[PDB]
Each structure stands twice: as structure tokens, then as C-alpha cells.
Design a protein around this ligand. Structure first.
Ligand SMILES: [Ca+2]
Ligand SMILES: [Ca+2]
Ligand code: NA
Lengths: 249, 246
DNA sequence: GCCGGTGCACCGGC
DNA sequence: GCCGGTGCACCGGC
């Protein structure tokens, strides 16, 4: 992690910060995070969309999607970070990618052909804990599937940054942060909430970090968990959404 | 319905309406209604606030809940046990992401729940989440259990807008009623928080049959659809990944 | 045309 | 403590 070694810097400058008072979060702190990481690690840090523009700017020779897709040099990273075929082809120097809500990552750090996908989960601390959607389980499955096919086991990490806040009035105030790597958690202990867009849910400060095996072992362990859980859900649908209503019909 | 009678008016006013750089067209819809039907028009939180101030004696959740005198409307409209419990005049209800409705219109003990759908028509059509299919099945169930078949309607107002400048402008609107649609035609997208999806303008409004019949039809449709999904998952999320784990 | 997966967190039952 | 359903709509493959 390019971040972990400065968690303390990060945490020191956030606690406070004070932002000013639908499907937006409630916290602009993510912006505050980026600003910092961009500030201090300026060579390594980008919004997902910014990284793609820069990727494309640096290769004007390459027009059209199939070719701009070869600019990733990685089926798995292609999968996580790229926009659709049409948008990529229409990519133009004077027509750049903007923020898409659907983008896999919030911030993204890259040094030496290795990627840290960083997702910030903000969280109102005054309220009753509700584990937020972390990332599609189904996306992660394909992601894992893709690592194994392409033996890309030493390419990227997907990490999370929890920033907690409350309302002293007028302004929101950050009161604490947490940082966790996903590929250091025990895969079989990941909560897949199917109904909630098939998302993994957890709080970052609650997240297991004692996986000891290899990345590859992680990916295979995750697929086993995923497949196990999909079978659970299917079975669980009958008693949950079928049995209780048959009386009426 | 309460707004259909003057829907044309609502439609002519909304077009041309501009909002600065489109979820807040919902506000305009609300302003217009409050101004044209002020005694009928409430935000969900507003209606609950108005009910509970009228009965300042009736404190606590159990007692407040009895205030609805309808197990169905209790279900679509109320807040949690602690929430109602800690309700105060100095601590009133506020907006809540997953409250059922955007706007409530009511008169003579009859309820029209109105969910406004904003749509960026600039961008290629993506059928929006309408309501939870599961919350709908429960609704139908209770509708049946307590024989509440003439109490409330769940209607939608599509508000189409585009990025016409430094801000957004409404270009058109549509108005459909859930209970007029064909139950077995409704698209349940299970992954998407199990949400029924559609474009108001695309919804059929021809259902021949009583409200009770609708509820039963939907329940047939839901139960059925659930079963299909059970199996769809093994093909989608189990078969395609078994290779990596043998 | 047809189809359905994803980002944002977020509440309340027992 | 455990657990999981709900609202916002919103793209891109073929
Ligand atoms: Ca985020
Ligand atoms: Ca709405
Ligand atoms: Na809705």
C-alpha cells in the first residue's frame, strides 16, 4: 500500500477538516482525502476518470477502443477501471472522461505498474451502524476469476478508507478514520448482502486483516465463498419470498 | 386520484421550470401541489409530524402506531419503534432516504402515495427502480388480510429534464398508476434491491379487475418470479465459477 | 431493442 | 449483537 505508510499523516490532517452542511453520501470528505493524497503524493494519485484521460493523452497515436484497451496491458485492470467501448472510442483530447457514479474506484494510486484501488466509505457516527455497500460481490467474483485466468496475482490491491464524522451543527466534522486492505481479510468471513445490489458489506474498522496465504489462494478462497453463498441465497429465496405468500394464491 | 384531475395544469407548469446545476425537480412538484392543494399535500415526514402533534397526549410507539388505524398504511408510512418513541415537537421527523413516498396526497381517509421519478432524457434510457417488489408483496398481502382494497393508490410522476445550460430544465412529464398496470407485466430486477423497474410513460394502464384481484395477480407474479430467480442464480453465479474451485 | 448489474450509504427488528 | 431490506436513478453489451 502506498497509503498505509502514511495513515498517520492522513489521520492527523483529517480529524477536524470540517466540511459545510437522493443518492449522494453526505460526506465531501472523499474530496478532502483526494486533495491531500494529490497534494503530497502528486505523482501517484488520480481520480479514476483522471487516470484514464492521462493514459489516453500520453498516447495520441492510439485512436479507437480496441486499441486504447490495449493501453491497459491487463484484462483484469481493463475490467475494473475502463469505460465502455463507445465512450472510449469517442474519447477525445477535447472530450475527456468525467466522473461516473458507477466507477469502481474513488481514488487510485499507481507506482511502478502496480495499482492501489482506494474506496472511501464516509459514515455518520451519530447514527446507528449500518454496514455500507463495499463492492459488488459479483464484480469481485469476475475480478478474481480474471486474476486466475491471467495469473495477474501481483498487480493491484483494493483498499478501503473509512472516515467518520458527526454534526456539531452547521458543519460536519471528521472525528476518526480507519484503513483496511481487502485482500488481507478472510474471504469466507465477508458478508454478501444479495438484496443490496449483491454487495459486500462491512465497516472498515471492523474488517478482518489476518489472511496469511497468497493472493492466488485468496482469489480461489473468495470464489468458493461466493459460489457457496449464491447457493444459500437461492435456497433462501423460497422460504423468504415464496412460502410466505402462497396462501394468497 | 387527486392530481390527475389537474394533471394537465401540472404538466404545463413543470415544463420550462429550471433548476441550477435532477432529483430536486421533486421540490417543484411539491411546491406546485402545496400551492394548488395545500390541505391535501404532505411530505411523508410532514404527514407523520401533523398526526402526532394533534395527539400530544398519545406518547410512545405502540400508542402512536394505533393512530394510523390501518395495518397497510402503518406499513408504508411509519418510522421505526424508537423513532416514533423519541418523537418530540422539539425533535420532529425529517427526511429519510428510504421512506416509501415523496409526496402524500390525502382527503376523506383516502391516500395517494406519489413517487416522482426524475429522468435525464439526454442519456440513454435506463428503467429506474420504482418500488421494492418485496415491499409490494407485503403490501398486497396486508391489503388482502385486512380487506383494505379501496384505501390508497401508489402512483408515479415522471419528470423529464435535460442539461440546457448552466442548469437543468424540465422538457416533459408522464403520470401512471401502479394499480392500473398489468401485475404480471411488471419487471422485477432482483439484483437492484429487488426493485420493480419501469418508465412511467411505458407503463400500461388498462388493468380490468378489482384492487383485490390486482393484489392476488401480483402475488402470483412475485412468487413465480422469485422461483425463477432461485434457479437463475445457480446458472449465473454458481455454474460460471465452479471451474476455479474444483 | 432487449436486458439487468452498480455506485452512494443508510435503519431498525428481536 | 445479528442481521438484511430501501431509497436515488443510472449504461452498455450484443
Ligand atoms: Ca465511496
Ligand atoms: Ca423519487
Ligand atoms: Na421509488
Amino acid at each position: 500500500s502506498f497509503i498505509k505508510p502514511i495513515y498517520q499523516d492522513i489521520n492527523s490532517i483529517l480529524i477536524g477538516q470540517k466540511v459545510k452542511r437522493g443518492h449522494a453520501a453526505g460526506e465531501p470528505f472523499e474530496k478532502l482525502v483526494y486533495k491531500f493524497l494529490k497534494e503530497n503524493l502528486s505523482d501517484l494519485t488520480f481520480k479514476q476518470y483522471e487516470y484514464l484521460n492521462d493514459l489516453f493523452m500520453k498516447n495520441p497515436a492510439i485512436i479507437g477502443h480496441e486499441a486504447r484497451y490495449k493501453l491497459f496491458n491487463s484484462p483484469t485492470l481493463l475490467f475494473l477501471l475502463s469505460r465502455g467501448k463507445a465512450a472510449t472510442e469517442n474519447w477525445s483530447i477535447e472530450n475527456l472522461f468525467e466522473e461516473k457514479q458507477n466507477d469502481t474506484a474513488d481514488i487510485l494510486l499507481v507506482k511502478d505498474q502496480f495499482y492501489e484501488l482506494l474506496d472511501v466509505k464516509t459514515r455518520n457516527i451519530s447514527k446507528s451502524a449500518f454496514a455500507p455497500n463495499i463492492i459488488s460481490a459479483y464484480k469481485l467474483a469476475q475480478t478474481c476469476a480474471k486474476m486466475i485466468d491471467n495469473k495477474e496475482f501481483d498487480l493491484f490491491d483494493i483498499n478501503y478508507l473509512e472516515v467518520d464524522w458527526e454534526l456539531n451543527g452547521e458543519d460536519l466534522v471528521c472525528v476518526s478514520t480507519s484503513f483496511a486492505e481487502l485482500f488481507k481479510s478472510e474471504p469466507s468471513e465477508l458478508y454478501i448482502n444479495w438484496a443490496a445490489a449483491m454487495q459486500i458489506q462491512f465497516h472498515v474498522r471492523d474488517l478482518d486483516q489476518g489472511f496469511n496465504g497468497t493472493r492466488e489462494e485468496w482469489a480461489k478462497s473468495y470464489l468458493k465463498h461466493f459460489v457457496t453463498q449464491a447457493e444459500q441465497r437461492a435456497i433462501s429465496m423460497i422460504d423468504k419470498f415464496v412460502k410466505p405468500f402462497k396462501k394468497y394464491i
